[PDB]
Amino acid sequence: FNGVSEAELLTKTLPDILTFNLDIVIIGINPGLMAAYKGHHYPGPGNHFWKCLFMSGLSEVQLNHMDDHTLPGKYGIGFTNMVERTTPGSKDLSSKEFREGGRILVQKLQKYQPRIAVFNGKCIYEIFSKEVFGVKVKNLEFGLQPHKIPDTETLCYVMPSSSARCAQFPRAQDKVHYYIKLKDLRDQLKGIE
DNA sequence: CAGCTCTGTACGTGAGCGATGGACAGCT
DNA sequence: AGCTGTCCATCGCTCAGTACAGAGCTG
């Protein structure tokens, strides 16, 4: 990491990119090493987020992590994470951390009230749902969820993690459907006013 | 028995490493 | 021609959640 130790990166955090009146908030699991290094969302050379955002038409050009600060004003997209703490993988986080994260995340969403809270990962929505709605899902599905963030009109939309670690959706192509459906949901909500 | 939870394990792509060797040019 | 060093193509390899079997538990 250009002479920067893994030990130093694990201490770093990644600032949220949140404003009011957003259409979408991308909720990641937590910052990975490269995200902590760069100070930008999804720089992972293999992470599919920026590729899926373009292939779906949520961005009209291929953007990258360096553009994340332009996303609220130009595309109506913000960013946060279920957990603040940096680690190399999603399995380095404890259940307590996730639940402490969900409580902080629900307050952030209740403050900014985006049209749609996007869970970039199934695992984080499984914990979120149980913690915030008291609902333990039997057959948890991707896409639009039946509960709004409490005391808001904010919807919950779930996608497989943009991380390339996930073998069930091996390519950015295998996840674009969900980004397209997200775009469709947004265009519907903007049309409904 | 029949459901639950909780943990352990297995799994596809493609980008980017370091290592290796071939192509090639400079010089004698 | 013979030698030596750089460069670059290419190789093999690592590595960035999810689903599910099955043990242990419990109604």
PDB file of C-alpha atoms (C1' of nucleotides) in Angstrom:
ATOM      1  CA  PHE A   1       0.000   0.000   0.000  1.00  0.00           C
ATOM      2  CA  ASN A   2       2.779   2.449  -1.186  1.00  0.00           C
ATOM      3  CA  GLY A   3       4.778   1.918   2.034  1.00  0.00           C
ATOM      4  CA  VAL A   4       1.707   2.370   4.306  1.00  0.00           C
ATOM      5  CA  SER A   5       1.326  -0.526   6.786  1.00  0.00           C
ATOM      6  CA  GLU A   6      -1.907  -2.530   7.210  1.00  0.00           C
ATOM      7  CA  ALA A   7      -1.704  -1.579  10.950  1.00  0.00           C
ATOM      8  CA  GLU A   8      -1.947   2.191  10.092  1.00  0.00           C
ATOM      9  CA  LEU A   9      -4.904   1.647   7.660  1.00  0.00           C
ATOM     10  CA  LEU A  10      -6.907  -0.369  10.264  1.00  0.00           C
ATOM     11  CA  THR A  11      -6.844   2.842  12.461  1.00  0.00           C
ATOM     12  CA  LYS A  12      -8.208   5.114   9.643  1.00  0.00           C
ATOM     13  CA  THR A  13     -11.914   5.789   8.997  1.00  0.00           C
ATOM     14  CA  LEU A  14     -13.824   6.796   5.872  1.00  0.00           C
ATOM     15  CA  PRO A  15     -15.948  10.013   6.010  1.00  0.00           C
ATOM     16  CA  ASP A  16     -19.650   9.693   5.146  1.00  0.00           C
ATOM     17  CA  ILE A  17     -20.955  11.693   2.108  1.00  0.00           C
ATOM     18  CA  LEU A  18     -24.412  12.718   3.325  1.00  0.00           C
ATOM     19  CA  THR A  19     -26.680  15.670   2.526  1.00  0.00           C
ATOM     20  CA  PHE A  20     -30.457  16.197   2.778  1.00  0.00           C
ATOM     21  CA  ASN A  21     -32.896  15.571  -0.151  1.00  0.00           C
ATOM     22  CA  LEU A  22     -30.870  12.613  -1.543  1.00  0.00           C
ATOM     23  CA  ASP A  23     -32.638  10.033  -3.668  1.00  0.00           C
ATOM     24  CA  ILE A  24     -30.260   7.268  -2.606  1.00  0.00           C
ATOM     25  CA  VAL A  25     -27.817   6.467   0.180  1.00  0.00           C
ATOM     26  CA  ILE A  26     -25.389   3.593  -0.520  1.00  0.00           C
ATOM     27  CA  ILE A  27     -24.811   1.739   2.755  1.00  0.00           C
ATOM     28  CA  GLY A  28     -21.642  -0.370   2.677  1.00  0.00           C
ATOM     29  CA  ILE A  29     -20.666  -3.001   5.229  1.00  0.00           C
ATOM     30  CA  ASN A  30     -17.542  -1.135   6.527  1.00  0.00           C
ATOM     31  CA  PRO A  31     -14.401   0.395   4.906  1.00  0.00           C
ATOM     32  CA  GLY A  32     -11.934  -2.085   3.457  1.00  0.00           C
ATOM     33  CA  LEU A  33      -8.158  -1.386   3.487  1.00  0.00           C
ATOM     34  CA  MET A  34      -8.060   0.456   0.082  1.00  0.00           C
ATOM     35  CA  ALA A  35     -11.090   2.590   1.033  1.00  0.00           C
ATOM     36  CA  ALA A  36      -9.329   3.622   4.296  1.00  0.00           C
ATOM     37  CA  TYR A  37      -6.139   4.346   2.347  1.00  0.00           C
ATOM     38  CA  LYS A  38      -7.804   6.562  -0.295  1.00  0.00           C
ATOM     39  CA  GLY A  39     -10.467   8.284   1.789  1.00  0.00           C
ATOM     40  CA  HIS A  40     -12.997   7.498  -0.987  1.00  0.00           C
ATOM     41  CA  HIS A  41     -15.880   5.039  -1.337  1.00  0.00           C
ATOM     42  CA  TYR A  42     -15.365   1.736  -3.239  1.00  0.00           C
ATOM     43  CA  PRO A  43     -11.833   2.254  -4.778  1.00  0.00           C
ATOM     44  CA  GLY A  44     -11.445  -1.589  -4.796  1.00  0.00           C
ATOM     45  CA  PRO A  45      -9.909  -2.196  -8.302  1.00  0.00           C
ATOM     46  CA  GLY A  46     -12.139  -5.315  -8.399  1.00  0.00           C
ATOM     47  CA  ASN A  47     -15.114  -3.892  -6.392  1.00  0.00           C
ATOM     48  CA  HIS A  48     -18.067  -3.698  -8.794  1.00  0.00           C
ATOM     49  CA  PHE A  49     -19.780  -0.581  -7.427  1.00  0.00           C
ATOM     50  CA  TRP A  50     -18.501   2.045  -9.947  1.00  0.00           C
ATOM     51  CA  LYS A  51     -18.768  -0.424 -12.888  1.00  0.00           C
ATOM     52  CA  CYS A  52     -22.434  -1.331 -11.898  1.00  0.00           C
ATOM     53  CA  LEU A  53     -23.350   2.378 -11.382  1.00  0.00           C
ATOM     54  CA  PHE A  54     -22.361   3.059 -15.025  1.00  0.00           C
ATOM     55  CA  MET A  55     -23.611  -0.218 -16.651  1.00  0.00           C
ATOM     56  CA  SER A  56     -27.047   0.440 -15.030  1.00  0.00           C
ATOM     57  CA  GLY A  57     -27.187   4.063 -16.223  1.00  0.00           C
ATOM     58  CA  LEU A  58     -27.113   5.550 -12.671  1.00  0.00           C
ATOM     59  CA  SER A  59     -24.057   7.495 -13.999  1.00  0.00           C
ATOM     60  CA  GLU A  60     -23.935   8.481 -17.717  1.00  0.00           C
ATOM     61  CA  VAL A  61     -20.106   7.994 -17.755  1.00  0.00           C
ATOM     62  CA  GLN A  62     -17.767   5.524 -15.977  1.00  0.00           C
ATOM     63  CA  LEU A  63     -16.942   7.179 -12.638  1.00  0.00           C
ATOM     64  CA  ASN A  64     -14.479   6.102  -9.986  1.00  0.00           C
ATOM     65  CA  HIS A  65     -13.947   6.464  -6.195  1.00  0.00           C
ATOM     66  CA  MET A  66     -12.391  10.001  -6.720  1.00  0.00           C
ATOM     67  CA  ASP A  67     -15.816  11.246  -7.919  1.00  0.00           C
ATOM     68  CA  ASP A  68     -17.773  10.136  -4.801  1.00  0.00           C
ATOM     69  CA  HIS A  69     -18.017  13.760  -3.421  1.00  0.00           C
ATOM     70  CA  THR A  70     -19.725  14.945  -6.671  1.00  0.00           C
ATOM     71  CA  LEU A  71     -22.463  12.212  -6.326  1.00  0.00           C
ATOM     72  CA  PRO A  72     -24.947  14.101  -3.999  1.00  0.00           C
ATOM     73  CA  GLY A  73     -25.184  17.246  -6.188  1.00  0.00           C
ATOM     74  CA  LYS A  74     -24.914  15.619  -9.620  1.00  0.00           C
ATOM     75  CA  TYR A  75     -26.628  12.221  -9.164  1.00  0.00           C
ATOM     76  CA  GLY A  76     -28.546  12.456  -5.843  1.00  0.00           C
ATOM     77  CA  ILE A  77     -26.409   9.679  -4.233  1.00  0.00           C
ATOM     78  CA  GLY A  78     -24.702   9.670  -0.834  1.00  0.00           C
ATOM     79  CA  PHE A  79     -22.640   7.154   1.106  1.00  0.00           C
ATOM     80  CA  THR A  80     -22.335   5.621   4.517  1.00  0.00           C
ATOM     81  CA  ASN A  81     -21.476   2.216   6.073  1.00  0.00           C
ATOM     82  CA  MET A  82     -23.183  -0.043   8.597  1.00  0.00           C
ATOM     83  CA  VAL A  83     -19.873  -0.084  10.592  1.00  0.00           C
ATOM     84  CA  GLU A  84     -17.319   2.798  10.804  1.00  0.00           C
ATOM     85  CA  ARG A  85     -14.315   0.589  11.775  1.00  0.00           C
ATOM     86  CA  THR A  86     -11.845  -0.414   9.014  1.00  0.00           C
ATOM     87  CA  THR A  87     -10.976  -4.191   8.586  1.00  0.00           C
ATOM     88  CA  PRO A  88      -9.742  -6.373   5.587  1.00  0.00           C
ATOM     89  CA  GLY A  89     -13.035  -8.384   5.531  1.00  0.00           C
ATOM     90  CA  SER A  90     -16.706  -8.464   6.612  1.00  0.00           C
ATOM     91  CA  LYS A  91     -15.879 -11.473   8.912  1.00  0.00           C
ATOM     92  CA  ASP A  92     -13.535  -9.426  11.153  1.00  0.00           C
ATOM     93  CA  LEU A  93     -16.575  -7.531  12.608  1.00  0.00           C
ATOM     94  CA  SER A  94     -18.455  -8.749  15.718  1.00  0.00           C
ATOM     95  CA  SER A  95     -22.246  -8.948  16.085  1.00  0.00           C
ATOM     96  CA  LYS A  96     -22.055  -6.181  18.793  1.00  0.00           C
ATOM     97  CA  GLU A  97     -20.206  -3.854  16.308  1.00  0.00           C
ATOM     98  CA  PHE A  98     -22.844  -4.489  13.649  1.00  0.00           C
ATOM     99  CA  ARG A  99     -25.668  -3.791  16.125  1.00  0.00           C
ATOM    100  CA  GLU A 100     -23.897  -0.674  17.467  1.00  0.00           C
ATOM    101  CA  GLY A 101     -23.554   0.307  13.760  1.00  0.00           C
ATOM    102  CA  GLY A 102     -27.212  -0.313  12.961  1.00  0.00           C
ATOM    103  CA  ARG A 103     -28.328   1.992  15.811  1.00  0.00           C
ATOM    104  CA  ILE A 104     -26.012   4.792  14.523  1.00  0.00           C
ATOM    105  CA  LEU A 105     -27.140   4.055  10.904  1.00  0.00           C
ATOM    106  CA  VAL A 106     -30.850   4.249  11.690  1.00  0.00           C
ATOM    107  CA  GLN A 107     -30.267   7.715  13.347  1.00  0.00           C
ATOM    108  CA  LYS A 108     -28.285   8.931  10.276  1.00  0.00           C
ATOM    109  CA  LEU A 109     -31.121   7.794   7.957  1.00  0.00           C
ATOM    110  CA  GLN A 110     -33.763   9.371  10.257  1.00  0.00           C
ATOM    111  CA  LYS A 111     -31.778  12.655  10.031  1.00  0.00           C
ATOM    112  CA  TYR A 112     -31.016  12.796   6.230  1.00  0.00           C
ATOM    113  CA  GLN A 113     -34.175  10.899   5.089  1.00  0.00           C
ATOM    114  CA  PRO A 114     -33.048   9.876   1.546  1.00  0.00           C
ATOM    115  CA  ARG A 115     -35.810   8.536  -0.745  1.00  0.00           C
ATOM    116  CA  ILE A 116     -34.142   5.065  -0.601  1.00  0.00           C
ATOM    117  CA  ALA A 117     -31.666   3.481   1.884  1.00  0.00           C
ATOM    118  CA  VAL A 118     -29.573   1.051  -0.226  1.00  0.00           C
ATOM    119  CA  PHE A 119     -28.004  -1.872   1.617  1.00  0.00           C
ATOM    120  CA  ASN A 120     -24.945  -2.762  -0.389  1.00  0.00           C
ATOM    121  CA  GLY A 121     -24.864  -6.289   1.022  1.00  0.00           C
ATOM    122  CA  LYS A 122     -27.421  -8.879   2.223  1.00  0.00           C
ATOM    123  CA  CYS A 123     -25.632  -9.624   5.568  1.00  0.00           C
ATOM    124  CA  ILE A 124     -25.977  -6.014   6.804  1.00  0.00           C
ATOM    125  CA  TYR A 125     -29.682  -5.937   5.944  1.00  0.00           C
ATOM    126  CA  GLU A 126     -30.242  -9.290   7.821  1.00  0.00           C
ATOM    127  CA  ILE A 127     -28.737  -7.638  10.969  1.00  0.00           C
ATOM    128  CA  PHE A 128     -30.506  -4.265  10.280  1.00  0.00           C
ATOM    129  CA  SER A 129     -33.985  -5.831   9.863  1.00  0.00           C
ATOM    130  CA  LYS A 130     -33.662  -7.905  13.114  1.00  0.00           C
ATOM    131  CA  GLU A 131     -32.356  -4.909  15.069  1.00  0.00           C
ATOM    132  CA  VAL A 132     -34.604  -2.107  13.730  1.00  0.00           C
ATOM    133  CA  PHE A 133     -37.826  -3.867  12.682  1.00  0.00           C
ATOM    134  CA  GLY A 134     -37.744  -6.886  15.054  1.00  0.00           C
ATOM    135  CA  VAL A 135     -38.094  -9.034  11.917  1.00  0.00           C
ATOM    136  CA  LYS A 136     -35.869 -12.132  11.459  1.00  0.00           C
ATOM    137  CA  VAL A 137     -36.304 -12.990   7.788  1.00  0.00           C
ATOM    138  CA  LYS A 138     -36.879 -16.669   6.830  1.00  0.00           C
ATOM    139  CA  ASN A 139     -36.313 -16.300   3.048  1.00  0.00           C
ATOM    140  CA  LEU A 140     -34.565 -12.897   2.810  1.00  0.00           C
ATOM    141  CA  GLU A 141     -34.750 -11.575  -0.684  1.00  0.00           C
ATOM    142  CA  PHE A 142     -32.883  -8.885  -2.572  1.00  0.00           C
ATOM    143  CA  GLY A 143     -34.647  -5.708  -3.792  1.00  0.00           C
ATOM    144  CA  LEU A 144     -37.438  -3.626  -2.181  1.00  0.00           C
ATOM    145  CA  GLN A 145     -38.110  -4.504   1.493  1.00  0.00           C
ATOM    146  CA  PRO A 146     -41.524  -4.188   3.203  1.00  0.00           C
ATOM    147  CA  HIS A 147     -40.478  -1.787   6.005  1.00  0.00           C
ATOM    148  CA  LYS A 148     -39.758   1.958   5.772  1.00  0.00           C
ATOM    149  CA  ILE A 149     -37.083   3.483   8.116  1.00  0.00           C
ATOM    150  CA  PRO A 150     -39.091   4.269  11.355  1.00  0.00           C
ATOM    151  CA  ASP A 151     -40.694   7.749  11.344  1.00  0.00           C
ATOM    152  CA  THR A 152     -39.670   8.379   7.677  1.00  0.00           C
ATOM    153  CA  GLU A 153     -40.864   7.650   4.105  1.00  0.00           C
ATOM    154  CA  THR A 154     -37.397   6.107   3.406  1.00  0.00           C
ATOM    155  CA  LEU A 155     -37.515   2.722   1.649  1.00  0.00           C
ATOM    156  CA  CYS A 156     -35.049  -0.181   2.165  1.00  0.00           C
ATOM    157  CA  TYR A 157     -33.548  -1.733  -0.980  1.00  0.00           C
ATOM    158  CA  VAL A 158     -31.069  -4.658  -0.736  1.00  0.00           C
ATOM    159  CA  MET A 159     -28.431  -5.700  -3.254  1.00  0.00           C
ATOM    160  CA  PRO A 160     -25.640  -8.314  -3.208  1.00  0.00           C
ATOM    161  CA  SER A 161     -22.394  -6.709  -2.030  1.00  0.00           C
ATOM    162  CA  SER A 162     -20.453  -4.908  -4.765  1.00  0.00           C
ATOM    163  CA  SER A 163     -17.352  -6.678  -3.247  1.00  0.00           C
ATOM    164  CA  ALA A 164     -15.873  -9.176  -5.792  1.00  0.00           C
ATOM    165  CA  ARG A 165     -15.298 -11.603  -2.836  1.00  0.00           C
ATOM    166  CA  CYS A 166     -18.875 -12.863  -3.449  1.00  0.00           C
ATOM    167  CA  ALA A 167     -18.802 -16.004  -5.697  1.00  0.00           C
ATOM    168  CA  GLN A 168     -22.647 -16.273  -6.273  1.00  0.00           C
ATOM    169  CA  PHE A 169     -22.643 -13.001  -8.354  1.00  0.00           C
ATOM    170  CA  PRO A 170     -19.086 -13.365  -9.775  1.00  0.00           C
ATOM    171  CA  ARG A 171     -19.117 -10.397 -12.185  1.00  0.00           C
ATOM    172  CA  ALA A 172     -20.318  -6.756 -12.163  1.00  0.00           C
ATOM    173  CA  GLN A 173     -22.682  -8.028 -14.911  1.00  0.00           C
ATOM    174  CA  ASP A 174     -24.271 -10.430 -12.371  1.00  0.00           C
ATOM    175  CA  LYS A 175     -25.205  -7.505 -10.081  1.00  0.00           C
ATOM    176  CA  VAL A 176     -26.295  -4.791 -12.630  1.00  0.00           C
ATOM    177  CA  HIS A 177     -29.948  -6.043 -12.544  1.00  0.00           C
ATOM    178  CA  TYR A 178     -30.296  -4.731  -8.931  1.00  0.00           C
ATOM    179  CA  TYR A 179     -28.733  -1.313  -9.885  1.00  0.00           C
ATOM    180  CA  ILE A 180     -31.147  -1.141 -12.832  1.00  0.00           C
ATOM    181  CA  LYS A 181     -34.100  -1.983 -10.551  1.00  0.00           C
ATOM    182  CA  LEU A 182     -32.822   0.670  -8.095  1.00  0.00           C
ATOM    183  CA  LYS A 183     -32.726   3.257 -10.939  1.00  0.00           C
ATOM    184  CA  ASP A 184     -36.332   2.171 -11.886  1.00  0.00           C
ATOM    185  CA  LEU A 185     -37.520   2.504  -8.235  1.00  0.00           C
ATOM    186  CA  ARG A 186     -35.915   6.015  -8.039  1.00  0.00           C
ATOM    187  CA  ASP A 187     -37.464   7.168 -11.382  1.00  0.00           C
ATOM    188  CA  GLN A 188     -40.878   5.857 -10.123  1.00  0.00           C
ATOM    189  CA  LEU A 189     -40.592   7.766  -6.749  1.00  0.00           C
ATOM    190  CA  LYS A 190     -39.428  10.932  -8.581  1.00  0.00           C
ATOM    191  CA  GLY A 191     -42.412  10.525 -11.000  1.00  0.00           C
ATOM    192  CA  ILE A 192     -44.888   9.931  -8.095  1.00  0.00           C
ATOM    193  CA  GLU A 193     -43.257  13.197  -6.659  1.00  0.00           C
TER     194      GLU A 193
ATOM    195  C1'  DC B   1     -38.893 -35.992  15.641  1.00  0.00           C
ATOM    196  C1'  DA B   2     -38.801 -31.082  13.769  1.00  0.00           C
ATOM    197  C1'  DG B   3     -37.444 -26.593  13.777  1.00  0.00           C
ATOM    198  C1'  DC B   4     -34.396 -23.085  15.284  1.00  0.00           C
ATOM    199  C1'  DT B   5     -29.504 -20.852  15.767  1.00  0.00           C
ATOM    200  C1'  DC B   6     -24.549 -20.564  15.043  1.00  0.00           C
ATOM    201  C1'  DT B   7     -20.392 -21.626  13.029  1.00  0.00           C
ATOM    202  C1'  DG B   8     -17.420 -23.746   9.457  1.00  0.00           C
ATOM    203  C1'  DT B   9     -16.575 -24.263   4.801  1.00  0.00           C
ATOM    204  C1'  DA B  10     -16.701 -23.873  -0.217  1.00  0.00           C
ATOM    205  C1'  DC B  11     -17.357 -21.222  -3.972  1.00  0.00           C
ATOM    206  C1'  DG B  12     -16.519 -17.757  -9.736  1.00  0.00           C
ATOM    207  C1'  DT B  13     -14.430 -13.780 -11.867  1.00  0.00           C
ATOM    208  C1'  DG B  14     -10.998 -10.613 -13.073  1.00  0.00           C
ATOM    209  C1'  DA B  15      -7.602  -7.072 -11.490  1.00  0.00           C
ATOM    210  C1'  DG B  16      -3.092  -6.627 -10.197  1.00  0.00           C
ATOM    211  C1'  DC B  17       1.110  -8.483  -8.085  1.00  0.00           C
ATOM    212  C1'  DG B  18       6.031 -10.423  -8.517  1.00  0.00           C
ATOM    213  C1'  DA B  19       8.776 -13.628 -11.426  1.00  0.00           C
ATOM    214  C1'  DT B  20      10.338 -15.214 -15.665  1.00  0.00           C
ATOM    215  C1'  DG B  21      11.985 -15.059 -20.171  1.00  0.00           C
ATOM    216  C1'  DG B  22      12.062 -13.326 -24.886  1.00  0.00           C
ATOM    217  C1'  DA B  23      12.777  -9.382 -27.992  1.00  0.00           C
ATOM    218  C1'  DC B  24      15.816  -5.968 -28.814  1.00  0.00           C
ATOM    219  C1'  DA B  25      19.292  -2.377 -28.893  1.00  0.00           C
ATOM    220  C1'  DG B  26      23.873  -0.542 -27.600  1.00  0.00           C
ATOM    221  C1'  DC B  27      28.313  -1.345 -27.575  1.00  0.00           C
ATOM    222  C1'  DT B  28      32.631  -3.819 -28.564  1.00  0.00           C
TER     223       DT B  28
ATOM    224  C1'  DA C   1      28.927 -12.054 -33.784  1.00  0.00           C
ATOM    225  C1'  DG C   2      29.145 -11.958 -28.856  1.00  0.00           C
ATOM    226  C1'  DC C   3      27.805  -9.940 -24.847  1.00  0.00           C
ATOM    227  C1'  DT C   4      24.977  -7.290 -21.558  1.00  0.00           C
ATOM    228  C1'  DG C   5      21.338  -4.815 -19.768  1.00  0.00           C
ATOM    229  C1'  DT C   6      16.402  -2.810 -20.050  1.00  0.00           C
ATOM    230  C1'  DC C   7      11.750  -3.424 -21.139  1.00  0.00           C
ATOM    231  C1'  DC C   8       7.569  -5.582 -21.732  1.00  0.00           C
ATOM    232  C1'  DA C   9       4.418  -9.663 -22.516  1.00  0.00           C
ATOM    233  C1'  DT C  10       2.743 -13.140 -20.143  1.00  0.00           C
ATOM    234  C1'  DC C  11       2.494 -16.419 -16.515  1.00  0.00           C
ATOM    235  C1'  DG C  12       0.817 -18.144 -12.118  1.00  0.00           C
ATOM    236  C1'  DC C  13      -0.955 -16.675  -8.208  1.00  0.00           C
ATOM    237  C1'  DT C  14      -3.514 -13.890  -4.612  1.00  0.00           C
ATOM    238  C1'  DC C  15      -7.574 -11.979  -3.127  1.00  0.00           C
ATOM    239  C1'  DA C  16     -11.844  -8.677  -2.840  1.00  0.00           C
ATOM    240  C1'  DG C  17     -19.893 -12.136   0.952  1.00  0.00           C
ATOM    241  C1'  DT C  18     -23.077 -15.587   0.521  1.00  0.00           C
ATOM    242  C1'  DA C  19     -25.438 -19.870   0.947  1.00  0.00           C
ATOM    243  C1'  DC C  20     -25.754 -23.915   3.017  1.00  0.00           C
ATOM    244  C1'  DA C  21     -24.775 -28.301   5.424  1.00  0.00           C
ATOM    245  C1'  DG C  22     -24.735 -29.976   9.867  1.00  0.00           C
ATOM    246  C1'  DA C  23     -23.789 -29.915  14.855  1.00  0.00           C
ATOM    247  C1'  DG C  24     -25.883 -28.480  19.093  1.00  0.00           C
ATOM    248  C1'  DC C  25     -29.707 -26.905  21.126  1.00  0.00           C
ATOM    249  C1'  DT C  26     -34.935 -26.722  22.248  1.00  0.00           C
ATOM    250  C1'  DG C  27     -39.926 -26.779  21.804  1.00  0.00           C
TER     251       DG C  27
END
